[PDB]
């Protein structure tokens, strides 16, 4: 899970994956361009991985090497930022909300 920010308001989830079949590191598992309620993508997008060596090598050599729409974008770690009454999942280790009973990785 690595986030990249600043994707324009007309970019398809494919538009980032049309040129991300060629960067370094072994091929990933899942890519999620964050959506909204009306059906728009607000600037940020997460990348999951099969392995951790692959993500490490991805951020290793080309952190500040990815240009689309004439603007560089950072590729930064993703660590949860919780609140007071937040729980944990015993099969994914993913932090999720309190008024919801299901995790966002397996359920
Ligand atoms: Zn989980």
Residue numbers in the entry: 8 to 114
Please quote the authors directly:
The RNA-binding motif protein RBM5 belongs to a family of multi-domain RNA binding proteins that regulate alternative splicing of genes important for apoptosis and cell proliferation and have been implicated in cancer. RBM5 comprises multiple domains, including an arginine/serine rich (RS) region, two RNA recognition motif (RRM) domains (RRM1 and RRM2), two zinc finger domains (ZnF1 and ZnF2), an OCRE domain (OCtamer REpeat)32 and a glycine-rich domain (G-patch) at the C-terminus. Notably, both of the RBM5 RRM domains are non-canonical as they lack the consensus aromatic residue in RNP2, which might impact their RNA recognition. To study how RBM5 recognizes cis-regulatory RNA motifs, we investigated the roles of the three RNA binding domains (RRM1-ZnF1-RRM2), which are connected by linkers L0 (7 residues, between RRM1 and ZnF1) and L1 (20 residues, between ZnF1 and RRM2).
